[PDB]
Amino acid sequence: IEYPVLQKILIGLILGAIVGLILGHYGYAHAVHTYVKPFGDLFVRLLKMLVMPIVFASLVVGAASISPARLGRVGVKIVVYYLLTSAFAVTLGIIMARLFNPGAGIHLAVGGAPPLVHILLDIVPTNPFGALANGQVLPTIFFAIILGIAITYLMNSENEKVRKSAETLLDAINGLAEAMYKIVNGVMQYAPIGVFALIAYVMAEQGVHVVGELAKVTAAVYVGLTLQILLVYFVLLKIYGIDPISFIKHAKDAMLTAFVTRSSSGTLPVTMRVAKEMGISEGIYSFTLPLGATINMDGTALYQGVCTFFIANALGSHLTVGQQLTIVLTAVLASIGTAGVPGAGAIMLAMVLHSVGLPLTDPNVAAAYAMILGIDAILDMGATMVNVTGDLTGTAIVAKTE
Amino acid sequence: IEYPVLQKILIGLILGAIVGLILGHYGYAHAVHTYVKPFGDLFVRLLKMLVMPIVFASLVVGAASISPARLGRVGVKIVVYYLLTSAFAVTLGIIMARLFNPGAGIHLAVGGQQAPPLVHILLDIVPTNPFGALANGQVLPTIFFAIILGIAITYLMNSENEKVRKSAETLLDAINGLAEAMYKIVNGVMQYAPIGVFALIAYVMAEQGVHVVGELAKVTAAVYVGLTLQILLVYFVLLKIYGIDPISFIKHAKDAMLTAFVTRSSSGTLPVTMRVAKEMGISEGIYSFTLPLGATINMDGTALYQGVCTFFIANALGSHLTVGQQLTIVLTAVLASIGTAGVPGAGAIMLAMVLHSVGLPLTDPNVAAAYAMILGIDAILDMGATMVNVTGDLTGTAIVAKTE
């Protein structure tokens, strides 16, 4: 139950990727799935477990921070933060989708409803207890904020049974909040097993596919986001003090979980614990790391920039070069929010085709789309890991302001 | 309601193929479907209409032929006929699938590397209610009844009673009244065949023509010339070798092939297919039992389409395909549905079913990807495969006929 720290993770990752990529090439991809996968799950399981308490609890406490600003500000900022990162991510994806040209081997050309208001009203839960119980991040967010603001106001009550109990609750809640961070490390001790087993399977069952013209989308994603980290985030970390390499130092574990869990929200326990140990206050990170996981577009903007190209160019089309954006922007904007779920990228890509006019019925549209689906998991890992890097970057910059 | 004969069809076919292929390239493939298709259907409608009477009626009469042999023989022959044509079709498909090599642009490899009873389909041949049989479609149980009825009528005529010998005639005549009546309609329909043909391969070229491009087109080559080579090298070799004049055959079988190609439906063309065997001069005692039992037992098409398409997939997922061990898979495909190859789109189904057997299931999103390309070209690869099946049906008939 001992041994080296987060190199033990990197020992799992590289050793897994190799043993999986090998094992699926020799076809046992299924056998890997029935023997290895469940240790990879048990990791995501234990992380998921925490996500609800660790968010709800932390954010009642995170409304002990100055309410009118802080939770009125920052929200204004971190929104405008993602605007100016997603903007850069879009043009970094398009200019990666021209650079690499994934549409040469195919080459096979075939011709050719959200209300918002009834999703805005969904933010406000009608039963917070249910909210928590039955998953749900973004209504639990809204409650916790409204609770901790209410508690704040109870402490300034001239009565002192009230001022009394007010404390009791908030403390007891912080008991939980803290308790969970304690577990998040208990889990992390199983993270090398979890990582090894996860990208063992994910490399067996979709690695072999990363070959040929399919691989030419994986290039423009993986180096396209590698360039989002270096050229857009570090440029923003450099320009706001906080030291770029000391950042990766601290954010090591949240990125290696985001990459492997492939789930933005499913890593928030680790994501948040890195912001504690980094030294941001709960009053910021408890509201910008969850509202990040669901509002962050850096990933989808960069994956449906190069994948949008791949399809438009594989059915042998111009793609209105430089009018890529018209489609890529409209994709992001169709689900500005709720990009946290794994596999979500594939869904919007399909949904865009409904808008493009090329419906998934056209058996060659469906053919090209199915190739992306044999590679989506690899393209999802990188997109989430660059999302949760972008989440902390957004946090640590706004934090070191307000 | 007048004008030139079957050139009017060829005027529809070439003019349609051009106007459709053009119209779908400019995207109106849907608009072609909502305006043109329904005149193309109305042709297949009217033909379908006849298929039940014209088979049932014709085959009761076709048991006026000498029963113990003729319907005991020929059946033995025409079975063994298709054995030796399908054998040749298999090796003509494989040796077309190597010749053209459809698996170069993809090239996109995914690992892997990895139920019919028959007896409960044999017992389905015997209907349990002939009336229903007829009513609710069903060719191959209506076949079995009609044969059993006309044999029974034959035996009633040799009855020493002469009310019996009397009514026996009445029925069989009245039935031949129908049988004939239908051939009369089959020309009434044919006068609408140029409109039908134009409208059908107008749409079929709009909605799947544009796809016949690149590596997809390299399967259409090895099908269309692969079956063009079945006609010339296998059927004419058998027509030459059995008297019946090869070019005088196409003369007579012109209309049955241009319907089979455009209706894409083996059984859906039997009215025309049969009328060509009347006007060719075979007896009902043969053609009424070898053209329907053909439409459902003929494999010349599927053997040649799932020879080159089986390759395309095995080779597009970048596999050896065990060259020369193609047959192992191609034979087992044909043999999985020896029968019931008559339905349109059937070829696609077995191709999928083979992958279940190969070990590469349709779930594997690149298996499903390559398969989906074939599905964007299936209709074009179906027209040719049915037209060469119904050419092989009449060839089988006219050769066995000119024997027994």
UniProtKB/Swiss-Prot annotation, chain B:
Extracellular topological domain residue ranges: 24-34, 97-114, 207-218, 309-325, 361-379
InterPro entries: Na-dicarboxylate_symporter, Na-dicarboxylate_symporter_CS, Na:dicarbo_symporter_sf
Protein residues bound to L-aspartate: R264, S265, S266, T302, V343, D382, N389
Annotated binding of Na(+) 2, by residue: T296, T340
Cytoplasmic side: 56-73, 149-184, 240-248, 278-285
Annotated phenotype, changing D393N: Strongly decreased affinity for aspartate
MF terms (GO), sorted A to Z: amino acid:sodium symporter activity; chloride transmembrane transporter activity; identical protein binding; L-aspartate transmembrane transporter activity; metal ion binding
UniProt keyword list: Amino-acid transport, Cell membrane, Chloride, Membrane, Metal-binding, Sodium, Symport, Transmembrane, Transmembrane helix, Transport
Single biological process term from Gene Ontology: L-aspartate import across plasma membrane
Keyword presence, DNA repair: no
Outcome (variant: M299A): Decreased dependence of aspartate binding on Na(+) concentration
Subcellular location: Cell membrane
Superkingdom assignment: Archaea
Pfam families tied to this protein: SDF
Main location: membrane
Transmembrane segments: 5-23, 35-55, 74-96, 115-148, 185-206, 219-239, 286-308, 380-400
Binding site for Na(+) 1: G294, N298, N389, D393
Reported effect, M383R: Increased rate of aspartate transport
Intramembrane region residues: 249-277, 326-360
Cellular component annotations (GO), alphabetically ordered: plasma membrane
Topology class, membrane: Multi-pass membrane protein
UniProt free text on domains: Contains eight transmembrane regions plus two helical hairpins that dip into the membrane. These helical hairpin structures play an important role in the transport process. The first enters the membrane from the cytoplasmic side, the second one from the extracellular side. During the transport cycle, the regions involved in amino acid transport, and especially the helical hairpins, move vertically by about 15-18 Angstroms, alternating between exposure to the aqueous phase and reinsertion in the lipid bilayer. In contrast, regions involved in trimerization do not move.
Protein task: Sodium-dependent, high-affinity amino acid transporter that mediates aspartate uptake. Has only very low glutamate transport activity. Functions as a symporter that transports one amino acid molecule together with two or three Na(+) ions, resulting in electrogenic transport. Na(+) binding enhances the affinity for aspartate. Mediates Cl(-) flux that is not coupled to amino acid transport; this avoids the accumulation of negative charges due to aspartate and Na(+) symport. In contrast to mammalian homologs, transport does not depend on pH or K(+) ions.
Family of the protein in this entry: Belongs to the dicarboxylate/amino acid:cation symporter (DAACS) (TC 2.A.23) family.
Subunit relationships: Homotrimer.
Name recorded for this polypeptide: Glutamate transporter homolog
